[PDB]
Design a protein around this ligand. Sequence first.
Ligand SMILES: O=C(Nc1ccn([C@@H]2O[C@H](CO)[C@@H](O)[C@H](F)[C@H]2O)c(=O)n1)c1ccccc1
Ligand SMILES: O=C(Nc1ccn([C@@H]2O[C@H](CO)[C@@H](O)[C@H](F)[C@H]2O)c(=O)n1)c1ccccc1
Lengths: 811, 811
Amino acid sequence: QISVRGLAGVENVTELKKNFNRHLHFTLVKDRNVATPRDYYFALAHTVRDHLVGRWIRTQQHYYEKDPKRIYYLSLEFYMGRTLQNTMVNLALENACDEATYQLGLDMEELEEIEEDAGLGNGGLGRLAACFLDSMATLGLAAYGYGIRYEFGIFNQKICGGWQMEEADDWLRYGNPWEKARPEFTLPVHFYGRVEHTSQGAKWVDTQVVLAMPYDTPVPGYRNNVVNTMRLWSAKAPNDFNLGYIQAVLDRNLAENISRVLYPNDNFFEGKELRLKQEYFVVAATLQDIIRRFKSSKTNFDAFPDKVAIQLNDTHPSLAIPELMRVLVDLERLDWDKAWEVTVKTCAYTNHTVLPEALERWPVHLLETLLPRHLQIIYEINQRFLNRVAAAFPGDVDRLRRMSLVEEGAVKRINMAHLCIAGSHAVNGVARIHSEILKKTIFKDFYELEPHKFQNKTNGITPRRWLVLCNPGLAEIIAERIGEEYISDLDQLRKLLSYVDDEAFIRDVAKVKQENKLKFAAYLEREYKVHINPNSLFDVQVKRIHEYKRQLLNCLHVITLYNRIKKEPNKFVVPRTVMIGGKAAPGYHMAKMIIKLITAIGDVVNHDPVVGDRLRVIFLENYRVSLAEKVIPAADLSEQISTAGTEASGTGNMKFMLNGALTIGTMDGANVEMAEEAGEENFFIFGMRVEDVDRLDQRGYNAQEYYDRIPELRQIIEQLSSGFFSPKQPDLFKDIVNMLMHHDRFKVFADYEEYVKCQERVSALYKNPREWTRMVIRNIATSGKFSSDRTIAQYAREIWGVEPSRQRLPA
Amino acid sequence: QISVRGLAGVENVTELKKNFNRHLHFTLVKDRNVATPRDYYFALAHTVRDHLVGRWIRTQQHYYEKDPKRIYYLSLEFYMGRTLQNTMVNLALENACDEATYQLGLDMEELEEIEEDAGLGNGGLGRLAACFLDSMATLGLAAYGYGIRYEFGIFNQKICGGWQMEEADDWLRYGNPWEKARPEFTLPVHFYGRVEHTSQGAKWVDTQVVLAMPYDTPVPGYRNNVVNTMRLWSAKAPNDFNLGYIQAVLDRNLAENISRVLYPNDNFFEGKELRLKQEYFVVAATLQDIIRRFKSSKTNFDAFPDKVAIQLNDTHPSLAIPELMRVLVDLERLDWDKAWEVTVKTCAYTNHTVLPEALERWPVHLLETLLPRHLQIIYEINQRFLNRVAAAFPGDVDRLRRMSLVEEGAVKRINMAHLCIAGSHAVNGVARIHSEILKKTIFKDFYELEPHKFQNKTNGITPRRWLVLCNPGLAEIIAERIGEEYISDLDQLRKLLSYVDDEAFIRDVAKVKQENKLKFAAYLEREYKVHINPNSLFDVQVKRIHEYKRQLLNCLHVITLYNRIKKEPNKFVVPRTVMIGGKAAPGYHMAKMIIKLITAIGDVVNHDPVVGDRLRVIFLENYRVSLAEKVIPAADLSEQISTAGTEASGTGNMKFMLNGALTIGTMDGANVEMAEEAGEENFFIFGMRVEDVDRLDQRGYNAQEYYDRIPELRQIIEQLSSGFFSPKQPDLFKDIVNMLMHHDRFKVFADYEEYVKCQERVSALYKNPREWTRMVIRNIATSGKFSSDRTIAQYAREIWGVEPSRQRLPA
Ligand SMILES: O=C(Nc1ccn([C@@H]2O[C@H](CO)[C@@H](O)[C@H](F)[C@H]2O)c(=O)n1)c1ccccc1
Ligand SMILES: O=C(Nc1ccn([C@@H]2O[C@H](CO)[C@@H](O)[C@H](F)[C@H]2O)c(=O)n1)c1ccccc1
């Protein structure tokens, strides 16, 4: 049908049809008379998987023969979404499969909707890992993703009476055709026990053993025949476990609970024992596998850093540092100093937030009981590190306190960020402003001691999933003008600046957006029975629910627009559909109240006859990767409105830019670099800068001042307090009003006036479709910097010491 | 190589080789350079499985079109063993696969050893279900086996310091290529709750729900292209289960524990709640599936018994009776009397033991809490049943007490056997003597009320697994004389009586036995580093460890032989290898002490220089179906020595007869019918008959009398007491001596003299190889009655009301 989706040759279609029929018969054990759409999905998935296997085997054989430096990306989260379409895209099979299924009387897009998301992450950090795997394969790096195979991923969100309800994400119920169990490579992991000192060093004895069983998933590069591996570990009890008899067998569940469920916290630290067990489990199994592969290569650990790089995705796998030391010192019998040199040169650390509540600080008493040898190693690392600090800054006693890996107080804790900096040769933030804030504030002391360690690597997104897959219409009109090479070299989108006055292109860009909006408007009615006006401006804020992300500021603007309409009903206003979506962590009360507020506003606004279809407020239920793929291409306006200095980068912002939405945002995270690329005239920037926030903090933030001086804001607060949005429960939102008025860490009121004014400027431009679209073209054209291919090429060259390759492996 | 294993045609071998290579590549994702023997096993299993699928689909399509009466065999146990060789045998693929693998440089028998047993049963009852499934498919019956998919089957037994240790049987660790998950046919099962009475009948409300997910395994008939289904249910929590958040997800384990593990009790009742849950889980899911299939056929439940038969394998699935009533009365709104008519005509019950401790008697308080509606139904069944008893036997108040389904006392209990008799149109024992004992003793009252219900169906074994598969050498020499038809018509073995004086045949029968013994002697050295003399008489007792089975009587004979050798070292004795094997239930202390005794005797006997290789005592570790397939063909002497009236049938006895061992046994269970078939002169019968046991009981059994009058027995008891077999722990066996002397329910001493004398007669015949073999031929020749094909044909005609068919389905 469309060019970017590849060829549908007679030979290929014929083979696909026959292999589809083979899988339905032999693999699924069904005939066409009894088969359901789900059976048809599985027959297609197995057919596509077959095309991966030869390339997968020969890629791994290639790495064994060539023996390049291997990259190990360690993460507790991989937010992969669906696999079928992505695999077809990267193998150039989409048009052929579309034709083959069409000829069998089936609709492929209907089959695609059957697949469960692999929802093994919370949000930005987990999705970053997923985009990174795609880019590493596309750039021919010998890269492996290592994590945990959670039985239950991020919960499914249902909205009941306007409230979030959580349901278990039983994603494996129908099986997972993509993974291959590798029970043959099962490895033991140790917990508890005690340390014995011999004349020949320390021994960790009397431990409990849990087995780590790997499952491998293929990661295809874009049309280069490279297939890398994501290896996820699953917890299993040994067979002599607890071995009255019945209870001992039932108690195996205790061991196997380690890989049962993803902790659903986004940017927040909960010091639970089970979470610590998960973090050690992934680190211990992964490091054994790395060492095994290194020894089987082609005794000398001096060359270890030449053949191995380990990237820590936040501090979650920080135990890799003392675990590597443990193995090298206790088991391989290296001297401390040599082991430490190897460790530092091997490990690098990526920081994802500056919010104090998100930082992992583990109580010493937990580590003492669970990982006694690791605590001893951490103490020794600390002692040697502080000795270097003391030598560099003699007499500076407070610096010693500030830099210690051990935090003193009521409960003694280990600061895992400090451990990561001490034990890594590179430390990076994830956008230019964030990386600067790290050096100036939270890690200033460390930057002074070791300036060479600190780097920036601005985040990116993969243009395969986030353009070609989710927005084929836009990909096609681009390819029609500039060819297909931009898909793996996104900087080529700059060539589109030559078409900003091209009447044909302007029309085509606008047509694709309208189609996407029509498709999404239909999706909503079909799946949720919710009506929307497809001619309205689609104003979208989708991301996890957090106070710092300021969904509440968006709510205030919505109520402002409603109040203005009620004041002057017969005045023209640009019609809007305001869509907000995202999950709240189950224990985060304020985030749950914010969801209730949004639905409560919708309940009033959507049923007011005077408003008509000029304003609609919709909460998008169960926001996840598959839903992002639908809503992002349909958006007109991207809301990126975090308080300056709080969102480290953002990546949702980049997805919207690539897909033809304009951005309203603060100068926060990557928004700064996006505006710099596109030009500030082509962005809707408002609000306090970081320096303005610092000034307000010095003075003291007083929310009452804003309430007193802004009558429109006063009205809204009075409406919330009095029960206008909750007539049955008049004091429902009192916690929200109280926080806003007395305890607001994120200064919602301070940006309100500038936000409302900026929103007026958005409505003004939307009234002029031609000029709206020209600004859109200027955004798409300068989105190239934000490809994760750029990001990974920078990690490769500046941290890992390897060169990317766009060259094909033989098919 | 050999005829009975089928053809190895060039076309077939070529196809098998290519499909083997395809599975290794695409299914296993391996190349030949990295593949292990386990990978090779899986490639072969998938290749053979492919041959099953077409026949499986078309068999089930055939039943839908023809709509015959369906047979549902309900069992908590299916002791299936390995599947690969059985599948090849029944499909006539063994020689072709042997050739194909040979050409790929692989040894098929080595690959076969990799497969885990499906050990989903304890012993005789579970293995009977497995032989039955094979016979039902071979006889073309539309039959379905329904049970539980235990994650952990019968434990693996390890012997450590002479003691039994138990290890979890993690049989699914590497996957199960034979099963197909059917998550689409998942059904809800209800527990707890309460009963509400409406104007329109009872309602069971406020229940907890557990999901039952089916897994289907193919059951191939012998060379008839029929493939039936065994459907096993697995427990899953609903997704809103317990839905702080983390704990609710972890607590799903509580629901899913229902299908976690097989209770390892053989002939013993433990009234645990989890076991009751298992019994209801299988019954509730199965009955819904039966009703669904009945409605989808081709409203009228009058024809239900014409289209459905349910066979209860013991009382374990007895809840089918009140569950069927519940569905018909509460949900389908039938009147009680009509529902009861349908229930009785649908259900039939097989009893497997008369031992009082094995009978299921559930405390009323358990049923009250777990299954409140079922208890109400059971009370109503009881009331109506006792009303009929009162009318038939007016004034007989004690009969009313004896026949009640409700047992009065300290703890009120429901007698499940009484429930089964009341609610079934047929009740059968499993051998002629057992069926007679039921009518004369434990169910006398019921037999008086309803004589027409009581039947006999003597047990049998499948000659596919228990001759062709495990003993191809014997199968081949038989086929050479009489053709191949006997494999599905075992009565044809009578034709062998014409060869009892044939010198060629006599030589061939003896040669096959020697080869089997050589193979087994080698297996022992290879796998267990244990040496045995292959020229000795192989004296074998393999079965679960129980006091009634009298492994202890065997032990006494062994010690007698040792003592006689020590007394007269230079006298000739026929050399023996005495092998005893079997598992003990983990909570059964005496059974564990018996295992220790056997190993302790071996420790003395096997290292006494004076004995030499004239006597060896070996405990066979981890007795299971796969081990039975090895040891049975190697045996010379089969020990079947239960106290008369205690072993209902036995089936191990029949396996030994078919494979060319002679039998030493009591007149118990099927031993009686075996001796009747072969002729008493061709059996080694000894000991008390049932009538002799009854006489001794009336008088009172005094073990001291035997100890006082038999000097050789006194010596043994004195050796056990004094610590001769446990020098480090002199009083180790005091519990055994005490039981024997004061509390022996099974009268070990009473049969000792006759047993020892009979054993002398065995040694006498073994000295004459030609006459030994002629007696063997007379046993094999008359083993035909003991085919499970005969047994199933009798169930079909006399209970289920269906005709068997030996006719082929089109391939
Ligand atoms: O902070 C935690 N978890 C975080 C932290 C940051 N992030 C996000 O990472 C993205 C990728 O770099 C950035 O674009 C965003 F700016 C950042 O907010 C995220 O998605 N989860 C956390 C802490 C303790 C326990 C669990 C999670
Ligand atoms: O009695 C129980 N479980 C039994 C009972 C009898 N049997 C056996 O069944 C074989 C097949 O008919 C016969 O050949 C044997 F004679 C008989 O002993 C057996 O293998 N398990 C039991 C009771 C409560 C709980 C669990 C098991």
